[PDB]
Design a binder for these strands. Sequence first.
RNA 1: UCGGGGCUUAAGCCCAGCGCCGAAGCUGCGGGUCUGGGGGAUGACCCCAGGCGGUAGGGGAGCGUUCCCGAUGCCGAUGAAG
RNA 2: GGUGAAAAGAACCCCGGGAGGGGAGUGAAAUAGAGCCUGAAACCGUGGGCUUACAAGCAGUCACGGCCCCGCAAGGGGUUGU
Lengths: 52, 137, 117, 101, 112
Amino acid sequence: AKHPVPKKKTSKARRDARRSHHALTPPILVPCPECKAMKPPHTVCPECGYYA
Amino acid sequence: KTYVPKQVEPRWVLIDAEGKTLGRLATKIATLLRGKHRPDWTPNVAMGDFVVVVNADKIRVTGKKLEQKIYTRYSGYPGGLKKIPLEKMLATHPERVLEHAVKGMLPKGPLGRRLFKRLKVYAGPDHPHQAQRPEKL
Amino acid sequence: PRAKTGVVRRRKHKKILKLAKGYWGLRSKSFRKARETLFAAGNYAYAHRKRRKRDFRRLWIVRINAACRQHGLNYSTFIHGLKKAGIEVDRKNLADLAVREPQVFAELVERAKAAQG
Amino acid sequence: MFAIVKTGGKQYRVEPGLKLRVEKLDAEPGATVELPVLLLGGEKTVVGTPVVEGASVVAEVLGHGRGKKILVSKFKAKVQYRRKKGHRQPYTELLIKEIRG
Amino acid sequence: MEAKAIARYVRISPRKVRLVVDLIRGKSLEEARNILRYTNKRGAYFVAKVLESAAANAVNNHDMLEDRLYVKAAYVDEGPALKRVLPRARGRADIIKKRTSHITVILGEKHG
RNA sequence: UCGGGGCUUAAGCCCAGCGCCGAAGCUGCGGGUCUGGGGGAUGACCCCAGGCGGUAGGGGAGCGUUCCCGAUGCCGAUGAAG
RNA sequence: GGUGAAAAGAACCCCGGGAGGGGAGUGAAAUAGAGCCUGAAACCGUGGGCUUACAAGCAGUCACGGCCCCGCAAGGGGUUGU
Ligand SMILES: [Mg+2]
Ligand SMILES: [Mg+2]
Ligand SMILES: [Mg+2]
Ligand SMILES: [Mg+2]
Ligand SMILES: [Mg+2]
Ligand SMILES: [Mg+2]
Ligand SMILES: [Mg+2]
Ligand SMILES: [Mg+2]
Ligand SMILES: [Mg+2]
Ligand SMILES: [Mg+2]
Ligand SMILES: [Mg+2]
Ligand SMILES: [Mg+2]
Ligand SMILES: [Mg+2]
Ligand SMILES: [Mg+2]
Ligand SMILES: [Mg+2]
Ligand SMILES: [Mg+2]
Ligand SMILES: [Mg+2]
Ligand SMILES: [Mg+2]
Ligand SMILES: [Mg+2]
Ligand SMILES: [Mg+2]
Ligand SMILES: [Mg+2]
Ligand SMILES: [Mg+2]
Ligand SMILES: [Mg+2]
Ligand SMILES: [Mg+2]
Ligand SMILES: [Mg+2]
Ligand SMILES: [Mg+2]
Ligand SMILES: [Mg+2]
Ligand SMILES: [Mg+2]
Ligand SMILES: [Mg+2]
Ligand SMILES: [Mg+2]
Ligand SMILES: [Mg+2]
Ligand SMILES: [Mg+2]
Ligand SMILES: [Mg+2]
Ligand SMILES: [Mg+2]
Ligand SMILES: [Mg+2]
Ligand SMILES: [Mg+2]
Ligand SMILES: [Mg+2]
Ligand SMILES: [Mg+2]
Ligand SMILES: [Mg+2]
Ligand SMILES: [Mg+2]
Ligand SMILES: [Mg+2]
């Protein structure tokens, strides 16, 4: 408001372009040795446990 | 309805250099980079012969151009204007001085820049003896 | 009797957005941006229809002069020759002969040569 | 064989048997017309003097018609001035028969 | 064949749920169940929940086999926004749009 | 930085000459409109010539929207308006 | 301000805490499903075709070329490289 403000509506082009790096990435997962299910590596998870 | 050529074929050519007046020669070279001599001239495709110059380190030039004529060169920074005289061009990179001319005589667009790539200048000769090479004058 | 705007305005707008299909961004979606674009478009074409005459007036001349010089003479002379001999043929375009049907060009060359001297 | 011919103001290369639309003509919708105008041939026949001194090319007129409309727009800015016209040029279609000449 | 499911009027901005949807478009059902299971986003919960329903329909309504169905396609569309005022400095007031989403997942048999 | 490249018995200046390129100017071909003259006993229509950049502004001819007469009519479920 | 001729306003089963859906069912029609006739535009999204990472722009126009699509054909439509 006070002082600076956009000089022009951003085009739907430039807008979406800015957003080119917004996409997510799937979580890193590995099949836990004990159970069959998936776990995030280096972590314990329910429906399972650990050795000592 | 006017004719339109098909996929041509790169005619190569071999030009001398010694004794040739820089600009005078530069003209002919350009007209060869474009078609303009090939009657199937097509201004949007590029099919002008490949040109290969040799012994460019020997080009003639009138007046006192060797000291008078100086090439400018701007870098983005302040005072970035460089003033290199002809004498120093040939003394160092000499194939350079032939380029700064023909390039300056080619069209400006994206095609023009492709044409520049069809030019091969050396101080030698001893250019890479690929294939065609019909010397001219 | 009241005559509300009704359909009239929509149809006139819609009728122009058609005309403006394929234009970049708003120039093809907004009626107002469209009309503006179309204005220039009409003038650009009208001016280019006059241009197209010259776009070939040239192309041919080069192509002619091109093959023309293979035979040792230049366009400006070639025409002096042809025009001298009264050979009003070869409306520049038809001097595509330089391309296909070369011999005939070579013929016209000698004719023009003999005419001039 | 090749044959340069003049009509409707423009010139045209012509082959035996060849469909070709040209500037409108006043002629039966099927009649035969020699374009008595002719220059050159497929075997060299330069029209030294303007026309070929004695020859011509036969052609039956397919029919008549009007070309696709062209919108001629005129617009002068700052000055509330616009004009719009639809133009459709007429043209008689031709079928080249003989090069006899 | 194919079996769809749609959760309409979900109180959550579409721009934000869309990220999670893009994350599982065309992947297996088992793959998605895991992806959405460990994706860190409020949107996952919703997209997962509609994903699950899309399965039951596939099976309990269209015979298709769980052991081999995937996300043929998916997408979110924006529904009507709840607008609210918002007191601002010097007495001015802004409206703030609490937006909303229609989430859609469509499944299909793996191969044939 | 002469627009640039580049140019020196010139691609500079002066004097002479033959060419060619070059506009939406002029010609060719087709068409429109107006105006005038002519044929048309004829409206219709045909022929010939000429005019047709345009702001303020004057004049002329049309297009669409709502409603009324034409309607105790006519179209409409084999599909109205949109 | 407007479901439909009529509530015949969707029993029952399925996923879900609910919302909301998917089937089943009513109806001439459910994309008439309940702020429900018609449902335009801006605006957001999914899929498909053409296109783009050496390129200088009032975003178009003119020409040629490539790809994709229509028709036996001459041809036409979309896109855009120079
Ligand atoms: Mg000096
Ligand atoms: Mg370009
Ligand atoms: Mg450009
Ligand atoms: Mg009004
Ligand atoms: Mg202007
Ligand atoms: Mg102005
Ligand atoms: Mg100069
Ligand atoms: Mg002299
Ligand atoms: Mg009269
Ligand atoms: Mg009278
Ligand atoms: Mg005038
Ligand atoms: Mg006027
Ligand atoms: Mg006045
Ligand atoms: Mg009137
Ligand atoms: Mg009646
Ligand atoms: Mg009836
Ligand atoms: Mg019925
Ligand atoms: Mg009927
Ligand atoms: Mg119907
Ligand atoms: Mg009405
Ligand atoms: Mg009720
Ligand atoms: Mg239900
Ligand atoms: Mg609870
Ligand atoms: Mg319910
Ligand atoms: Mg159902
Ligand atoms: Mg039924
Ligand atoms: Mg129906
Ligand atoms: Mg139904
Ligand atoms: Mg409908
Ligand atoms: Mg309905
Ligand atoms: Mg509602
Ligand atoms: Mg609504
Ligand atoms: Mg009704
Ligand atoms: Mg819409
Ligand atoms: Mg897309
Ligand atoms: Mg590609
Ligand atoms: Mg570009
Ligand atoms: Mg530029
Ligand atoms: Mg295809
Ligand atoms: Mg066909
Ligand atoms: Mg383009």
